[PDB]
């Protein structure tokens, strides 16, 4: 009975840090995907398990819009079976992933003179994230043989690092807004359908 609220996600006034990535459920609505892709203002738009052209013909269940900001060189990690600080420690897609990754450059918005240090990422963690896990803790990471007991110092690291987006950064060091659309193929009452979708 609704059109899917993609404006609230994509045109959102604020974006989360990748480590505290934001998840919005999308349900009980019709998603015109073509208005996103045919309005191609996106540096990245790759799908997994479906083809971008057949999306308006499909119905899904359990549809989620995850969103965050990362660097250009890290968009590569928002994909199944990747490795690196983002995929291991911040946002991990399953290997069986069905969904679309969408990304665009936000230097115009997320960069400030002298640096924008609001966006953070996790640099250390005792283990890799399971798919779709979310870790927002700030405990000192013990990289050595002595327990930190909440004190930063030698081998005792605050787990989060700022990006520091500056307008003159190289493109791979510039901020990108990312939206991951996660679907599950139809095996239950459909929650979201394309305009020409078959239940």
């Amino acid at each position, epitope marked *: 009975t609704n059109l899917c609220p993609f404006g609230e996600v994509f045109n959102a006034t604020r974006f989360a840090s990748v480590y505290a990535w934001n998840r919005k459920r999308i349900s009980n609505c019709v998603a015109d995907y073509s208005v996103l892709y045919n309005s191609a203002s996106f540096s990245t738009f790759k799908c997994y398990g479906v083809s971008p052209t057949k999306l308006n013909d499909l119905c899904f269940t359990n549809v989620y819009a995850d969103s965050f900001v990362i660097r250009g060189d890290e968009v590569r990690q928002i994909a199944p079976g990747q490795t690196g600080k983002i995929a291991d420690y911040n946002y991990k897609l399953p290997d069986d992933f069905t969904g679309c990754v969408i990304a665009w450059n936000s230097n115009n918005l997320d960069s400030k003179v002298g640096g924008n240090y609001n966006y953070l990422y996790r640099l250390f963690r005792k283990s890799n994230l399971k798919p779709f896990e979310r870790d927002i803790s*700030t405990e000192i990471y013990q990289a050595g043989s002595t327990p930190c007991n909440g004190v930063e110092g030698f081998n005792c690291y605050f787990p989060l690092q700022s990006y520091g987006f500056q307008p003159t950064n190289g493109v791979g060091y510039q901020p990108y807004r990312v939206v991951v659309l996660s679907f599950e193929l139809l095996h239950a009452p459909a929650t979201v359908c394309g305009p020409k979708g078959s239940h």
Partner: antibody
Framework: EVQLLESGGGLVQPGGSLRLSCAAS????????MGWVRQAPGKGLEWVSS????????YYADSVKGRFTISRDNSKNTLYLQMNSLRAEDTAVYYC??????????????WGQGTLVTVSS | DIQMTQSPSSLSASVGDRVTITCRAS??????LNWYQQKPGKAPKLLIY???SLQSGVPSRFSGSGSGTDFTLTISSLQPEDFATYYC?????????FGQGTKVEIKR
């Protein structure tokens, strides 16, 4: 360590009012969605209310709509529950809790210790 | 709205046993069901989310199954620290609700 500490509980007369606070620490408060869950003595858990990170959307159980208001102050890392028109059946331990992801996906992964609210003449 | 029937309300079991608790929702709620443990005088503790996902730090003997309206929590090989009350919880849509709990007690 992520911590949620409730305060403001205690005794209140029927028809009266009480404001609960939850102080959060150990994480960036303005990234998280929060809620209130309560438990009457010897009875089960009952979801009370939820708010998202910037207060734009709020949710209430039927049993408290119109009387309870959830709100938050991110600059003070504090969650609030304003309870008006209190009744005996509102007597309970009130738990503050945090969503692991958001109001529209996932569980409450972090809980406070709770404060006791007693509504009685 | 949506009612949630948890059964049984109590059960007695021995260390080593396999315990199953069931939760039935009145409407179709996909995988949006969570499972918590609570011991006398303490806050609830998340065990399982989205019907079948094990929360980090929770032993693998806890397992969740089910979809749509019928859900089960399974503790294979009950441990002495597992005797407690368990709650299912509808996560979507609002308003949320909890099951009324199952107390797992020890036989003697």
């Amino acid at each position: 360590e992520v911590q949620l500490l409730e305060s403001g509980g205690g005794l209140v007369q029927p028809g009266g009012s009480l404001r609960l606070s939850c102080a959060a620490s150990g994480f960036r408060f303005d990234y998280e969605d929060m809620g209130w869950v309560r438990q009457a003595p010897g009875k089960g858990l009952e979801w009370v209310s939820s708010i998202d990170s910037h207060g734009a959307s709020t949710y209430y159980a039927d049993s408290v709509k119109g009387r309870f208001t959830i709100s938050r102050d991110n600059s003070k890392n504090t969650l609030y529950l304003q309870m008006n028109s209190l009744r005996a059946e509102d007597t309970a331990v009130y738990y503050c809790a945090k969503y692991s992801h958001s109001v529209s996906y996932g569980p409450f992964d972090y809980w406070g210790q709770g404060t006791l609210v007693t509504v009685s003449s | 709205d949506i009612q949630m029937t948890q059964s049984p309300s109590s059960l007695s079991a021995s260390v080593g046993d396999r315990v199953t608790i069931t939760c039935r929702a009145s409407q179709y709620i996909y995988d949006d069901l969570n499972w918590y443990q609570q011991k006398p005088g303490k806050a609830p503790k998340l065990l399982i989310y989205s019907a079948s996902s094990l929360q980090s730090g929770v032993p693998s003997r806890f397992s969740g199954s089910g979809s749509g309206t019928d859900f089960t929590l399974t503790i294979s090989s009950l441990q002495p620290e597992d005797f407690a009350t368990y709650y299912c919880q509808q996560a979507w849509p609002y308003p949320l609700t909890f099951g009324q709990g199952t107390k797992v007690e020890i036989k003697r």
